[PDB]
Scaffold this active site. Sequence first.
Site, PDB file in Angstrom:
ATOM      1  CE1 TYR A   1     -45.834  27.157  -8.898  1.00 46.55           C
ATOM      2  CE2 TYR A   1     -47.029  28.343 -10.599  1.00 46.55           C
ATOM      3  CZ  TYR A   1     -45.988  27.520 -10.220  1.00 46.55           C
ATOM      4  OH  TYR A   1     -45.101  27.059 -11.166  1.00 46.55           O
TER       5      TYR A   1
ATOM      6  CG  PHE B   1     -53.029  30.509 -17.385  1.00 45.24           C
ATOM      7  CD1 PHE B   1     -53.653  31.000 -16.250  1.00 45.24           C
ATOM      8  CD2 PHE B   1     -51.832  31.079 -17.787  1.00 45.24           C
ATOM      9  CE1 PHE B   1     -53.094  32.040 -15.530  1.00 45.24           C
ATOM     10  CE2 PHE B   1     -51.268  32.119 -17.072  1.00 45.24           C
ATOM     11  CZ  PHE B   1     -51.900  32.599 -15.941  1.00 45.24           C
ATOM     12  CG  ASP B   2     -48.655  27.895 -14.515  1.00 46.55           C
ATOM     13  OD1 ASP B   2     -48.284  27.389 -13.435  1.00 46.55           O
ATOM     14  OD2 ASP B   2     -47.867  28.207 -15.432  1.00 46.55           O
TER      15      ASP B   2
ATOM     16  CB  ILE C   1     -45.838  39.301  -9.082  1.00 45.03           C
ATOM     17  CG1 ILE C   1     -47.006  38.413  -8.647  1.00 45.03           C
ATOM     18  CG2 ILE C   1     -45.266  38.821 -10.407  1.00 45.03           C
ATOM     19  CD1 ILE C   1     -48.076  38.259  -9.705  1.00 45.03           C
TER      20      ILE C   1
ATOM     21  CE1 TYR D   1     -47.836  37.654 -15.463  1.00 44.88           C
ATOM     22  CE2 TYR D   1     -48.602  38.029 -17.699  1.00 44.88           C
ATOM     23  CZ  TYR D   1     -48.077  37.189 -16.739  1.00 44.88           C
ATOM     24  OH  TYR D   1     -47.794  35.880 -17.055  1.00 44.88           O
TER      25      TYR D   1
ATOM     26  CG  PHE E   1     -51.619  32.582  -9.681  1.00 46.06           C
ATOM     27  CD1 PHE E   1     -51.947  33.525 -10.641  1.00 46.06           C
ATOM     28  CD2 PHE E   1     -50.671  31.618  -9.990  1.00 46.06           C
ATOM     29  CE1 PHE E   1     -51.342  33.510 -11.884  1.00 46.06           C
ATOM     30  CE2 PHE E   1     -50.063  31.598 -11.231  1.00 46.06           C
ATOM     31  CZ  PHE E   1     -50.400  32.544 -12.179  1.00 46.06           C
TER      32      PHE E   1
HETATM   33  C1  JZF Z   1     -43.455  38.050 -12.926  1.00 39.18           C
HETATM   34  C2  JZF Z   1     -43.853  36.567 -12.886  1.00 39.18           C
HETATM   35  O1  JZF Z   1     -43.646  36.083 -11.539  1.00 39.18           O
HETATM   36  C3  JZF Z   1     -42.895  34.978 -11.338  1.00 39.18           C
HETATM   37  O2  JZF Z   1     -41.693  34.994 -11.160  1.00 39.18           O
HETATM   38  C4  JZF Z   1     -43.721  33.709 -11.352  1.00 39.18           C
HETATM   39  N1  JZF Z   1     -44.709  33.670 -12.463  1.00 39.18           N
HETATM   40  C5  JZF Z   1     -44.241  33.620 -13.750  1.00 39.18           C
HETATM   41  O3  JZF Z   1     -43.051  33.582 -13.991  1.00 39.18           O
HETATM   42  C6  JZF Z   1     -45.219  33.625 -14.912  1.00 39.18           C
HETATM   43  C7  JZF Z   1     -46.552  32.967 -14.532  1.00 39.18           C
HETATM   44  C8  JZF Z   1     -47.569  32.883 -15.715  1.00 39.18           C
HETATM   45  C9  JZF Z   1     -47.160  32.305 -17.106  1.00 39.18           C
HETATM   46  O4  JZF Z   1     -47.458  30.907 -17.190  1.00 39.18           O
HETATM   47  C10 JZF Z   1     -47.634  33.092 -18.380  1.00 39.18           C
HETATM   48  C11 JZF Z   1     -47.975  32.186 -19.602  1.00 39.18           C
HETATM   49  C12 JZF Z   1     -48.445  32.986 -20.841  1.00 39.18           C
HETATM   50  C13 JZF Z   1     -49.847  33.611 -20.644  1.00 39.18           C
HETATM   51  C14 JZF Z   1     -47.385  34.045 -21.228  1.00 39.18           C
HETATM   52  C15 JZF Z   1     -46.993  34.957 -20.039  1.00 39.18           C
HETATM   53  C16 JZF Z   1     -45.877  35.934 -20.474  1.00 39.18           C
HETATM   54  C17 JZF Z   1     -46.584  34.105 -18.842  1.00 39.18           C
HETATM   55  O5  JZF Z   1     -45.457  34.146 -18.382  1.00 39.18           O
HETATM   56  C18 JZF Z   1     -47.083  33.627 -13.249  1.00 39.18           C
HETATM   57  C19 JZF Z   1     -46.042  33.657 -12.148  1.00 39.18           C
HETATM   58  O6  JZF Z   1     -46.424  33.700 -10.995  1.00 39.18           O
END
Ligand code: JZF
Length: 117
Positions: free
Chosen positions: A37, A47-48, A67, A93, A110
């Site tokens: 990913y 950014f990842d 997600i 998000y 992604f």
């Molecule tokens: C619900 C997430 O789903 C997962 O369980 C897997 N997942 C993450 O945990 C966060 C990822 C992105 C992070 O790197 C960003 C970094 C900064 C922008 C702050 C923000 C709060 C984040 O967390 C995207 C992802 O796919």
Amino acid sequence: GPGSMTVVTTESGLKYEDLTEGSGAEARAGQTVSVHYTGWLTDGQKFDSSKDRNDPFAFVLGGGMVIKGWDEGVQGMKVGGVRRLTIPPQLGYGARGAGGVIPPNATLVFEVELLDV
Ligand SMILES: CCOC(=O)CN1C(=O)CC(C[C@@H](O)[C@@H]2C[C@@H](C)C[C@H](C)C2=O)CC1=O
């Protein structure tokens, strides 16, 4: 950059764009597989990257900890296939926000790259 993009969207909201052929096997909910990913932004900036650990993301489909956009992408990509999938807030998000520059309507894309099943 700011503007539009040549990406196909679905009825759910998430988008997809072929990046590299594969011709392997589409993942299935319930089976474990390894995929890569790449956290990409609307502008295209990353950014990842999984490269941080240097290893394929292996987990169980339709029963992990990701997600909607992730599950939808992992439950569609095929082994050896690489394609970018736009994961919107309504499927990721949300309107909860996660930063100043990150609005409640912000979208994150992604890059999914299937390695093996
Ligand atoms: C619900 C997430 O789903 C997962 O369980 C897997 N997942 C993450 O945990 C966060 C990822 C992105 C992070 O790197 C960003 C970094 C900064 C922008 C702050 C923000 C709060 C984040 O967390 C995207 C992802 O796919």
